[PDB]
Amino acid sequence: MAQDALSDGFVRLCIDPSLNFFGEGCKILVEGQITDDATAAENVVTCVNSELDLVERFGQGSVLTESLRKVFCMCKSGVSVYALPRADAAAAVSAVYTLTVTGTALTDGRVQLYMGEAEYSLDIGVDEGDTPTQIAAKIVAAISPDFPYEATAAAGVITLTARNGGTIGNHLSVIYTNLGSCTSVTPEGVTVAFAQTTPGSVNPEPNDYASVVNECCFAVYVLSSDDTDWQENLRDWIRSAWDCSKPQCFGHGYVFNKGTLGQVLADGDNSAELSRLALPTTYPVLPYLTNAAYGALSACSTCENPELNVQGQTYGLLSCINMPESCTPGWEFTEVTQLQNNGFVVSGPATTSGQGNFTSPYIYNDVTNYLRDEKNRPNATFRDASSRRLAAATGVALATFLQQFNGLAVFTKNTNIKTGIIGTNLRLMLGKIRKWASDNVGVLFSEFDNINEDIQLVSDFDVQPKCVGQPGVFHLNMRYRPPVRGARINVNLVPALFDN
Amino acid sequence: DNINEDIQLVSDFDVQPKCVGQPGVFHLNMRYRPPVRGARINVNLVPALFDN
Amino acid sequence: MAQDALSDGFVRLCIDPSLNFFGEGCKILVEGQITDDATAAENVVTCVNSELDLVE
Amino acid sequence: TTYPVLPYLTNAAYGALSACSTCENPELNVQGQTYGLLSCINMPESCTPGWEFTEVTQLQNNGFVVSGPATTSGQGNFTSPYIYNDVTNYLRDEKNRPNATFRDASSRRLAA
Amino acid sequence: GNHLSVIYTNLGSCTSVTPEGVTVAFAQTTPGSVNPEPNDYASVVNECCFAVYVLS
């Protein structure tokens, strides 16, 4: 039994509210810790298809699953997500914090605490007085399973210990939002204190990228760790992906650095391959969540066109992260200027107030840690990440163009081509290359300073000594500039008065 | 390279000793090269920044 | 493998913003005093490549 | 050692491509992603190439034909290989002198 | 025949749901020993022109 309009089988109808027409966007790789209850294989890259399989595959409340949660939040489409799970060192210890409640509530109301991120913050209320600290600590009825820490729920005071060992858990921050003036009435006589009691000690230091990411290409690398040694290994891998010794894969990596001004400036190892997210000691959010948000935002979820800058309050808004409002900005303006001038990406809140509501941050500058070329000359050639993106795009675009000369007859010495032959020579190849370069002014390039000096073609015979040059081998030199864009306006405002 | 040295033709009477050569027998020597074609291009790419 | 456009090995790409196309222009000699903390050999003509090797 | 395909199938495909479907004009080189694609062979994608680039360079410089896949990924889908260099095993000379007279397979066809 | 290779594509996670609890292992137990070595080309390919030879 069938239906008339469909019975003959000319139209074959399929109804599915879960199909996706989008093609396979670029690739992003996320690397972080896992836990024992994970079912994914250690030290092996895998593909992730949606939010839902986390925890089962990558463990409960582990760093990697939390990072992937933001990665899949900033990208509704146009990206492919890959994961590189890592395991904790066997000797690593877990950091410990104590949240000691005190007093005895004597007025009814609500108490709402901020923990790590807006998702892990909870609002819990009490409807009667005379509740001791024992009736307090009922918070555990609200703490989510995904919180990266475990609450002991002891006798009146709850202790917090990280799930993943090492220094990564050494960053939890707890804030009493309603302690100050607010429109929500807080129980009177309640005082909650937060303090640390033990740090982490050991972090894993894998050095095997050449075996797990051997040849597959990735666009953005996100590393959920704060260890300088691990970051240097990733930097070396990206160096390798760009070296001229063999065909290149390119790519750009994102890391963070938390500390005081004098400490953060000590991590500037002139890395053109890294964007370093400088954060202060008093930062109220888990750093790797912000790092993952920035990485996933810049990972072609916006950059389908490589020349776009991830800046400002529109194209650089990390809308997946929420932090409470505060008067203190985190960095002073002079500290911000120093960080920006030394090669660190600085973020800030989208609004300021003392009421303590939730706000999202954004990014002031999209910069790489590059400050000096290989001859130690300071310049801004690779100051912006868009410069690296454009260099990668130009390399591929130029490589595709030159393919037409592969297998084409080449005439040297006597350069007269007999009628009917299919071939070329140096002068005609140079003309075609110049024409292609000129056609691209406005897309890849800015106008050329002197096109007669920027592009040069020579044959291997002209270079090598007699009887050593190989036949059919050519050398090309090309110098170029990327397009310019508005950066700043300095305004002088002079209020006069009506006169004469 | 040099057509005058790359092709040479000689008769048998010129080569074999006297009274041993044969009539209507020739020796030809030819040297040639195959055609050349594009093989590789070495590209140096030197990014800069707008100045002056 | 790397990337499809660069995999076959016909085009071998090098990206280095510190390269120079200029040939060697003719030479100039600079003669003057040094100090005891310099690491250069006295009374020996040597080439200088950039402004930054100085002092030491 | 880790080649994931039956060795003789690749050899047969290469020979069939280089014999008739291409070389009725003897000066063509069976290389690249267009004129040297073995479209009748499919193998899963892999992050590992089988040969490191230095090994590839050594094999090429020692008179061996090397090949690789047309595309790379970790998902494991099917891809076809192609020939990097269409080269014979010729080195040295009948008088023991290194030269490249018969380096390319098209040289033999042109000589014939 | 000493060259067979068997690969489990969906051992790692993929868009195809591999049943859980299933594992397949592959190994060799006995190799080959002897191959033919004919030397009679002069009688079967006697003066007939072939452009390409394939040896499987």
Side-chain angles (χ1 to χ4, degrees):
Chain A
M1 185 180 288
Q3 195 163 4
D4 276 19
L6 299 166
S7 64
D8 60 12
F10 168 61
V11 178
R12 306 280 284 95
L13 185 63
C14 164
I15 294 175
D16 196 351
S18 70
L19 298 155
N20 64 317
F21 309 162
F22 314 110
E24 205 266 320
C26 74
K27 290 137 83 166
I28 188 167
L29 183 76
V30 179
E31 153 174 2
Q33 315 273 12
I34 62 170
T35 53
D36 59 60
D37 50 310
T39 60
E42 177 181 303
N43 288 329
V44 169
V45 173
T46 64
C47 183
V48 188
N49 213 5
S50 77
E51 293 82 3
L52 311 179
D53 283 18
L54 275 46
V55 176
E56 293 83 3
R57 290 173 71 176
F58 303 108
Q60 288 176 9
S62 57
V63 174
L64 182 60
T65 177
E66 302 303 330
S67 309
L68 285 163
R69 271 192 210 297
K70 296 302 185 190
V71 174
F72 282 102
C73 178
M74 280 275 117
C75 311
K76 295 310 189 46
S77 64
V79 68
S80 306
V81 191
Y82 291 69
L84 174 43
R86 303 295 198 165
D88 313 288
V93 65
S94 300
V96 189
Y97 316 101
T98 66
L99 188 78
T100 185
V101 188
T102 55
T104 290
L106 61 89
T107 63
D108 64 315
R110 312 180 83 95
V111 64
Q112 184 177 2
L113 291 149
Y114 168 78
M115 291 195 318
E117 199 272 333
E119 176 41 35
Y120 310 143
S121 304
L122 58 85
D123 166 26
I124 190 167
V126 67
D127 51 352
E128 282 294 354
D130 303 338
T131 53
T133 60
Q134 295 298 109
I135 286 181
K138 58 185 314 170
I139 297 153
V140 179
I143 297 169
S144 67
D146 305 89
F147 194 60
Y149 298 72
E150 293 291 330
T152 81
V157 304
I158 65 183
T159 305
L160 291 158
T161 57
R163 290 188 171 161
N164 281 115
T167 73
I168 288 166
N170 189 359
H171 294 294
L172 183 44
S173 184
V174 176
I175 297 169
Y176 193 10
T177 301
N178 296 295
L179 184 63
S181 188
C182 187
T183 62
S184 67
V185 184
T186 61
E188 185 53 281
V190 178
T191 59
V192 185
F194 179 74
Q196 179 146 19
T197 55
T198 314
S201 63
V202 176
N203 297 328
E205 176 153 338
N207 189 9
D208 52 7
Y209 293 105
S211 302
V212 294
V213 179
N214 181 245
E215 290 265 309
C216 50
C217 320
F218 291 109
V220 167
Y221 288 91
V222 184
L223 174 55
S224 301
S225 183
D226 67 350
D227 197 331
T228 302
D229 315 306
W230 202 351
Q231 293 176 356
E232 179 149 310
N233 288 347
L234 185 61
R235 192 270 299 257
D236 286 2
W237 174 238
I238 307 289
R239 282 270 213 271
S240 178
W242 278 77
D243 213 38
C244 63
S245 304
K246 64 180 175 65
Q248 296 95 354
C249 292
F250 310 125
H252 194 265
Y254 295 77
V255 299
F256 68 90
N257 293 87
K258 173 167 162 188
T260 77
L261 182 68
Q263 301 173 352
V264 177
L265 269 71
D267 304 339
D269 57 345
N270 195 44
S271 299
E273 295 88 5
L274 293 175
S275 283
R276 297 190 175 284
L277 188 63
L279 306 171
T281 45
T282 59
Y283 194 66
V285 193
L286 292 167
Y288 48 84
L289 297 176
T290 310
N291 191 37
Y294 177 27
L297 178 60
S298 66
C300 303
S301 182
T302 61
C303 311
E304 176 166 27
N305 63 6
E307 76 287 330
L308 175 145
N309 283 330
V310 179
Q311 302 169 17
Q313 300 197 0
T314 302
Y315 296 117
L317 178 58
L318 308 177
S319 59
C320 58
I321 296 195
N322 275 290
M323 51 196 318
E325 301 213 275
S326 180
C327 316
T328 300
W331 295 105
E332 294 200 339
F333 184 74
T334 53
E335 304 185 305
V336 165
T337 303
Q338 272 169 91
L339 291 167
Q340 288 190 339
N341 283 358
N342 281 288
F344 292 90
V345 173
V346 180
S347 63
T351 177
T352 293
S353 189
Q355 293 225 309
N357 306 272
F358 294 133
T359 58
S360 297
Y362 72 87
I363 296 163
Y364 292 3
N365 52 322
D366 213 8
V367 168
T368 62
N369 199 245
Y370 168 90
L371 279 179
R372 280 171 318 281
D373 63 330
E374 282 313 338
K375 272 181 187 133
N376 198 248
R377 280 174 182 290
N379 58 34
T381 301
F382 283 141
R383 189 198 274 142
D384 303 89
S386 61
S387 294
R388 302 278 290 189
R389 293 197 275 269
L390 278 169
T394 306
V396 171
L398 180 45
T400 299
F401 178 73
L402 289 178
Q403 192 68 15
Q404 72 189 262
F405 302 116
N406 183 8
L408 190 67
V410 175
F411 289 97
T412 48
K413 299 199 71 178
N414 190 351
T415 54
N416 292 17
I417 313 172
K418 311 219 314 186
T419 292
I421 291 173
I422 298 172
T424 196
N425 62 357
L426 271 167
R427 299 289 290 171
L428 300 163
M429 288 184 63
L430 181 54
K432 285 184 75 65
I433 293 164
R434 282 167 51 119
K435 180 65 176 145
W436 168 90
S438 303
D439 286 347
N440 272 267
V441 170
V443 180
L444 293 179
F445 305 139
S446 187
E447 71 184 89
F448 279 79
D449 193 353
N450 190 4
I451 188 54
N452 301 286
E453 311 295 30
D454 285 21
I455 307 176
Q456 304 179 335
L457 191 79
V458 188
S459 74
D460 193 73
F461 283 14
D462 293 2
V463 168
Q464 311 297 30
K466 185 93 190 54
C467 296
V468 187
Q470 304 149 91
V473 178
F474 289 105
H475 303 252
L476 179 69
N477 300 320
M478 181 155 148
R479 181 201 298 134
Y480 78 92
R481 284 101 61 90
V484 181
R485 292 180 184 270
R488 183 168 55 169
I489 302 178
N490 293 316
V491 183
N492 296 340
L493 202 62
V494 187
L497 195 80
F498 205 111
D499 50 27
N500 288 4
Chain B
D1 211 8
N2 192 6
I3 193 66
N4 303 288
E5 319 278 339
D6 286 22
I7 304 169
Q8 301 186 336
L9 184 69
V10 186
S11 78
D12 208 55
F13 295 160
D14 271 352
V15 175
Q16 308 302 345
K18 203 72 70 154
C19 308
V20 182
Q22 296 148 112
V25 173
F26 311 104
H27 300 279
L28 173 58
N29 303 326
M30 189 166 132
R31 186 191 299 113
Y32 71 97
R33 302 144 147 188
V36 180
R37 297 185 177 268
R40 162 180 287 192
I41 305 177
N42 290 317
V43 182
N44 290 359
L45 196 64
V46 191
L49 204 77
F50 210 94
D51 54 16
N52 293 118
Chain C
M1 293 182 179
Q3 292 183 357
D4 283 0
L6 292 160
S7 182
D8 60 6
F10 170 67
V11 166
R12 307 281 282 95
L13 180 73
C14 182
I15 304 178
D16 194 356
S18 73
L19 285 160
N20 63 7
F21 306 168
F22 306 128
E24 183 178 1
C26 293
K27 326 195 262 196
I28 177 180
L29 188 73
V30 181
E31 185 191 271
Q33 316 272 30
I34 60 170
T35 54
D36 293 326
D37 48 304
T39 62
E42 184 178 359
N43 297 324
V44 175
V45 179
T46 69
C47 182
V48 192
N49 224 337
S50 73
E51 302 116 310
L52 294 174
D53 312 342
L54 295 174
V55 176
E56 60 264 12
Chain D
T1 46
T2 69
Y3 195 58
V5 189
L6 294 164
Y8 37 89
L9 297 178
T10 303
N11 188 359
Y14 180 27
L17 176 62
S18 179
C20 305
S21 178
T22 300
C23 296
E24 303 314 275
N25 54 82
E27 75 281 354
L28 190 150
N29 291 330
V30 175
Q31 309 168 10
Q33 297 210 341
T34 299
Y35 294 113
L37 180 72
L38 314 184
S39 61
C40 296
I41 287 169
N42 277 273
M43 51 205 198
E45 268 147 30
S46 174
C47 295
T48 307
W51 296 111
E52 278 198 349
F53 191 72
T54 57
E55 305 180 306
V56 167
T57 305
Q58 287 206 44
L59 295 169
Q60 291 188 338
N61 287 359
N62 286 286
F64 289 93
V65 172
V66 190
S67 60
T71 180
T72 299
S73 186
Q75 295 214 320
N77 306 275
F78 291 139
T79 64
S80 301
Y82 69 84
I83 309 286
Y84 291 172
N85 51 305
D86 194 11
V87 163
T88 62
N89 201 237
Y90 170 88
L91 294 167
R92 274 171 301 291
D93 193 325
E94 184 58 23
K95 194 132 61 193
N96 187 28
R97 212 186 265 288
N99 63 35
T101 301
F102 286 131
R103 214 191 71 251
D104 293 327
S106 52
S107 291
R108 303 286 291 195
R109 298 190 278 264
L110 282 162
Chain E
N2 212 48
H3 296 279
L4 180 60
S5 186
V6 184
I7 304 174
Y8 193 10
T9 298
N10 287 324
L11 192 57
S13 192
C14 186
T15 64
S16 295
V17 178
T18 187
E20 293 82 3
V22 184
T23 61
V24 176
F26 184 70
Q28 179 158 10
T29 51
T30 51
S33 62
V34 176
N35 294 323
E37 200 184 289
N39 199 10
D40 51 3
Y41 287 111
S43 306
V44 296
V45 184
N46 196 39
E47 282 216 340
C48 52
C49 301
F50 287 107
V52 168
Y53 294 84
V54 186
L55 179 52
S56 299

mmCIF file of all heavy atoms in Angstrom, chain D residues 14 59-65 85-91 100-109:
data_model
loop_
_atom_site.group_PDB
_atom_site.id
_atom_site.type_symbol
_atom_site.label_atom_id
_atom_site.label_comp_id
_atom_site.label_asym_id
_atom_site.label_seq_id
_atom_site.Cartn_x
_atom_site.Cartn_y
_atom_site.Cartn_z
ATOM 1 N N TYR D 14 50.095 0.055 -13.125
ATOM 2 C CA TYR D 14 51.139 0.928 -13.651
ATOM 3 C C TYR D 14 51.548 0.510 -15.057
ATOM 4 O O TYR D 14 51.678 1.357 -15.949
ATOM 5 C CB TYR D 14 52.346 0.913 -12.714
ATOM 6 C CG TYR D 14 53.503 1.782 -13.160
ATOM 7 C CD1 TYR D 14 53.298 2.896 -13.960
ATOM 8 C CD2 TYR D 14 54.804 1.483 -12.780
ATOM 9 C CE1 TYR D 14 54.353 3.684 -14.366
ATOM 10 C CE2 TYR D 14 55.864 2.266 -13.181
ATOM 11 C CZ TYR D 14 55.633 3.365 -13.973
ATOM 12 O OH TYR D 14 56.686 4.149 -14.377
ATOM 13 N N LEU D 59 65.181 6.615 -2.452
ATOM 14 C CA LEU D 59 64.675 5.691 -3.459
ATOM 15 C C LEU D 59 64.696 6.331 -4.839
ATOM 16 O O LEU D 59 65.095 5.700 -5.824
ATOM 17 C CB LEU D 59 63.258 5.245 -3.098
ATOM 18 C CG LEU D 59 63.114 4.413 -1.824
ATOM 19 C CD1 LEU D 59 61.648 4.273 -1.461
ATOM 20 C CD2 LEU D 59 63.761 3.050 -1.985
ATOM 21 N N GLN D 60 64.265 7.591 -4.931
ATOM 22 C CA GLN D 60 64.273 8.277 -6.218
ATOM 23 C C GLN D 60 65.689 8.427 -6.754
ATOM 24 O O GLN D 60 65.937 8.202 -7.943
ATOM 25 C CB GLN D 60 63.604 9.643 -6.088
ATOM 26 C CG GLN D 60 62.109 9.579 -5.840
ATOM 27 C CD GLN D 60 61.455 10.940 -5.914
ATOM 28 O OE1 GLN D 60 62.114 11.965 -5.751
ATOM 29 N NE2 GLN D 60 60.152 10.958 -6.160
ATOM 30 N N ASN D 61 66.633 8.806 -5.894
ATOM 31 C CA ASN D 61 68.014 8.985 -6.316
ATOM 32 C C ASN D 61 68.717 7.670 -6.620
ATOM 33 O O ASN D 61 69.801 7.693 -7.210
ATOM 34 C CB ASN D 61 68.796 9.739 -5.242
ATOM 35 C CG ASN D 61 68.425 11.204 -5.174
ATOM 36 O OD1 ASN D 61 67.592 11.682 -5.943
ATOM 37 N ND2 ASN D 61 69.042 11.928 -4.249
ATOM 38 N N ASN D 62 68.138 6.533 -6.230
ATOM 39 C CA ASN D 62 68.744 5.231 -6.490
ATOM 40 C C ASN D 62 67.958 4.417 -7.512
ATOM 41 O O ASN D 62 68.015 3.185 -7.494
ATOM 42 C CB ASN D 62 68.896 4.451 -5.184
ATOM 43 C CG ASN D 62 70.014 4.989 -4.318
ATOM 44 O OD1 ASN D 62 71.191 4.786 -4.609
ATOM 45 N ND2 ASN D 62 69.652 5.689 -3.251
ATOM 46 N N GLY D 63 67.226 5.077 -8.404
ATOM 47 C CA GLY D 63 66.625 4.405 -9.538
ATOM 48 C C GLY D 63 65.383 3.598 -9.253
ATOM 49 O O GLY D 63 65.145 2.602 -9.945
ATOM 50 N N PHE D 64 64.582 3.983 -8.265
ATOM 51 C CA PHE D 64 63.352 3.277 -7.931
ATOM 52 C C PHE D 64 62.152 4.195 -8.112
ATOM 53 O O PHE D 64 62.198 5.373 -7.746
ATOM 54 C CB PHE D 64 63.390 2.751 -6.495
ATOM 55 C CG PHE D 64 64.330 1.601 -6.300
ATOM 56 C CD1 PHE D 64 65.633 1.812 -5.893
ATOM 57 C CD2 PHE D 64 63.906 0.304 -6.523
ATOM 58 C CE1 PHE D 64 66.494 0.756 -5.716
ATOM 59 C CE2 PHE D 64 64.765 -0.757 -6.348
ATOM 60 C CZ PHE D 64 66.059 -0.531 -5.944
ATOM 61 N N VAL D 65 61.079 3.648 -8.682
ATOM 62 C CA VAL D 65 59.854 4.412 -8.865
ATOM 63 C C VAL D 65 59.068 4.419 -7.562
ATOM 64 O O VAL D 65 58.774 3.362 -6.990
ATOM 65 C CB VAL D 65 59.021 3.825 -10.014
ATOM 66 C CG1 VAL D 65 57.655 4.495 -10.077
ATOM 67 C CG2 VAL D 65 59.765 3.972 -11.333
ATOM 68 N N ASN D 85 57.859 9.660 -9.984
ATOM 69 C CA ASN D 85 58.884 9.723 -11.019
ATOM 70 C C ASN D 85 58.775 8.489 -11.898
ATOM 71 O O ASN D 85 58.745 7.364 -11.391
ATOM 72 C CB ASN D 85 60.284 9.817 -10.405
ATOM 73 C CG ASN D 85 60.537 8.746 -9.369
ATOM 74 O OD1 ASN D 85 59.785 8.607 -8.409
ATOM 75 N ND2 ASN D 85 61.604 7.983 -9.558
ATOM 76 N N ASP D 86 58.714 8.700 -13.212
ATOM 77 C CA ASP D 86 58.673 7.605 -14.181
ATOM 78 C C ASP D 86 60.097 7.315 -14.657
ATOM 79 O O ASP D 86 60.552 7.776 -15.704
ATOM 80 C CB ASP D 86 57.752 7.962 -15.340
ATOM 81 C CG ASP D 86 57.408 6.770 -16.201
ATOM 82 O OD1 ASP D 86 57.713 5.631 -15.794
ATOM 83 O OD2 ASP D 86 56.829 6.972 -17.288
ATOM 84 N N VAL D 87 60.801 6.520 -13.856
ATOM 85 C CA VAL D 87 62.240 6.339 -13.997
ATOM 86 C C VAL D 87 62.570 4.858 -14.111
ATOM 87 O O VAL D 87 61.928 4.006 -13.491
ATOM 88 C CB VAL D 87 62.985 6.982 -12.807
ATOM 89 C CG1 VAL D 87 64.404 6.474 -12.711
ATOM 90 C CG2 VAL D 87 62.982 8.490 -12.943
ATOM 91 N N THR D 88 63.585 4.559 -14.918
ATOM 92 C CA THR D 88 64.144 3.221 -15.015
ATOM 93 C C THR D 88 65.252 3.043 -13.982
ATOM 94 O O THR D 88 65.702 3.995 -13.343
ATOM 95 C CB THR D 88 64.695 2.959 -16.418
ATOM 96 O OG1 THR D 88 65.756 3.878 -16.699
ATOM 97 C CG2 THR D 88 63.608 3.115 -17.461
ATOM 98 N N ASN D 89 65.707 1.803 -13.831
ATOM 99 C CA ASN D 89 66.727 1.479 -12.843
ATOM 100 C C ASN D 89 68.140 1.748 -13.343
ATOM 101 O O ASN D 89 69.100 1.221 -12.771
ATOM 102 C CB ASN D 89 66.597 0.017 -12.416
ATOM 103 C CG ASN D 89 67.249 -0.257 -11.081
ATOM 104 O OD1 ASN D 89 68.122 -1.114 -10.968
ATOM 105 N ND2 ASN D 89 66.824 0.470 -10.057
ATOM 106 N N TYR D 90 68.288 2.559 -14.386
ATOM 107 C CA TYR D 90 69.593 2.784 -14.989
ATOM 108 C C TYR D 90 70.439 3.721 -14.140
ATOM 109 O O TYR D 90 69.986 4.787 -13.715
ATOM 110 C CB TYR D 90 69.422 3.362 -16.391
ATOM 111 C CG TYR D 90 70.698 3.855 -17.038
ATOM 112 C CD1 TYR D 90 71.505 2.998 -17.768
ATOM 113 C CD2 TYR D 90 71.080 5.184 -16.937
ATOM 114 C CE1 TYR D 90 72.661 3.448 -18.368
ATOM 115 C CE2 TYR D 90 72.234 5.640 -17.533
ATOM 116 C CZ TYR D 90 73.020 4.770 -18.248
ATOM 117 O OH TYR D 90 74.171 5.224 -18.843
ATOM 118 N N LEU D 91 71.680 3.309 -13.896
ATOM 119 C CA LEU D 91 72.705 4.151 -13.301
ATOM 120 C C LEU D 91 74.039 3.769 -13.922
ATOM 121 O O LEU D 91 74.176 2.718 -14.554
ATOM 122 C CB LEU D 91 72.765 4.003 -11.776
ATOM 123 C CG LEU D 91 71.554 4.480 -10.977
ATOM 124 C CD1 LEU D 91 71.624 3.972 -9.550
ATOM 125 C CD2 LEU D 91 71.484 5.995 -10.996
ATOM 126 N N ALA D 100 72.904 10.344 -16.854
ATOM 127 C CA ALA D 100 71.447 10.295 -16.845
ATOM 128 C C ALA D 100 70.860 10.085 -18.236
ATOM 129 O O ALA D 100 69.730 10.508 -18.496
ATOM 130 C CB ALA D 100 70.884 11.574 -16.229
ATOM 131 N N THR D 101 71.598 9.434 -19.135
ATOM 132 C CA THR D 101 71.123 9.275 -20.506
ATOM 133 C C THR D 101 69.818 8.488 -20.551
ATOM 134 O O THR D 101 68.870 8.879 -21.240
ATOM 135 C CB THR D 101 72.192 8.589 -21.354
ATOM 136 O OG1 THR D 101 73.393 9.368 -21.334
ATOM 137 C CG2 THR D 101 71.719 8.437 -22.787
ATOM 138 N N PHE D 102 69.750 7.372 -19.825
ATOM 139 C CA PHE D 102 68.561 6.531 -19.786
ATOM 140 C C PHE D 102 67.811 6.643 -18.463
ATOM 141 O O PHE D 102 67.139 5.691 -18.057
ATOM 142 C CB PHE D 102 68.938 5.072 -20.048
ATOM 143 C CG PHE D 102 69.275 4.773 -21.483
ATOM 144 C CD1 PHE D 102 70.426 4.079 -21.805
ATOM 145 C CD2 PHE D 102 68.440 5.176 -22.509
ATOM 146 C CE1 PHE D 102 70.739 3.799 -23.117
ATOM 147 C CE2 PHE D 102 68.748 4.897 -23.821
ATOM 148 C CZ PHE D 102 69.899 4.209 -24.126
ATOM 149 N N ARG D 103 67.909 7.787 -17.784
ATOM 150 C CA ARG D 103 67.236 7.944 -16.499
ATOM 151 C C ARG D 103 65.724 7.848 -16.653
ATOM 152 O O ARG D 103 65.050 7.180 -15.862
ATOM 153 C CB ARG D 103 67.624 9.278 -15.867
ATOM 154 C CG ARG D 103 67.707 9.243 -14.355
ATOM 155 C CD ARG D 103 67.828 10.639 -13.771
ATOM 156 N NE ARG D 103 66.583 11.387 -13.910
ATOM 157 C CZ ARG D 103 66.396 12.414 -14.729
ATOM 158 N NH1 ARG D 103 67.363 12.869 -15.511
ATOM 159 N NH2 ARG D 103 65.204 13.004 -14.766
ATOM 160 N N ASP D 104 65.171 8.509 -17.665
ATOM 161 C CA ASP D 104 63.727 8.543 -17.852
ATOM 162 C C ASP D 104 63.277 7.401 -18.752
ATOM 163 O O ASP D 104 63.941 7.068 -19.737
ATOM 164 C CB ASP D 104 63.302 9.879 -18.459
ATOM 165 C CG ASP D 104 63.526 11.045 -17.520
ATOM 166 O OD1 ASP D 104 63.398 10.859 -16.293
ATOM 167 O OD2 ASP D 104 63.833 12.152 -18.009
ATOM 168 N N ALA D 105 62.136 6.801 -18.409
ATOM 169 C CA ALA D 105 61.609 5.703 -19.207
ATOM 170 C C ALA D 105 61.261 6.133 -20.623
ATOM 171 O O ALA D 105 61.310 5.303 -21.536
ATOM 172 C CB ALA D 105 60.372 5.106 -18.536
ATOM 173 N N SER D 106 60.913 7.405 -20.831
ATOM 174 C CA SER D 106 60.595 7.868 -22.176
ATOM 175 C C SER D 106 61.823 7.855 -23.073
ATOM 176 O O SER D 106 61.692 7.837 -24.302
ATOM 177 C CB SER D 106 60.001 9.273 -22.124
ATOM 178 O OG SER D 106 60.831 10.144 -21.381
ATOM 179 N N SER D 107 63.021 7.875 -22.485
ATOM 180 C CA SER D 107 64.234 7.824 -23.290
ATOM 181 C C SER D 107 64.328 6.524 -24.072
ATOM 182 O O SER D 107 64.745 6.528 -25.233
ATOM 183 C CB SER D 107 65.462 7.993 -22.402
ATOM 184 O OG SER D 107 65.537 9.308 -21.886
ATOM 185 N N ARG D 108 63.954 5.402 -23.456
ATOM 186 C CA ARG D 108 63.992 4.128 -24.163
ATOM 187 C C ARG D 108 63.001 4.110 -25.322
ATOM 188 O O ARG D 108 63.329 3.647 -26.424
ATOM 189 C CB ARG D 108 63.701 2.991 -23.186
ATOM 190 C CG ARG D 108 64.649 2.941 -21.999
ATOM 191 C CD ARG D 108 66.021 2.427 -22.395
ATOM 192 N NE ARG D 108 65.992 1.014 -22.753
ATOM 193 C CZ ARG D 108 67.066 0.244 -22.864
ATOM 194 N NH1 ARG D 108 68.282 0.720 -22.659
ATOM 195 N NH2 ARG D 108 66.915 -1.036 -23.183
ATOM 196 N N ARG D 109 61.786 4.613 -25.094
ATOM 197 C CA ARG D 109 60.797 4.668 -26.164
ATOM 198 C C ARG D 109 61.285 5.548 -27.306
ATOM 199 O O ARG D 109 61.137 5.197 -28.482
ATOM 200 C CB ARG D 109 59.469 5.193 -25.623
ATOM 201 C CG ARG D 109 58.839 4.329 -24.551
ATOM 202 C CD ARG D 109 57.427 4.787 -24.236
ATOM 203 N NE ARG D 109 57.408 5.904 -23.299
ATOM 204 C CZ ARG D 109 57.235 5.794 -21.988
ATOM 205 N NH1 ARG D 109 57.071 4.619 -21.404
ATOM 206 N NH2 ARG D 109 57.231 6.894 -21.241
#
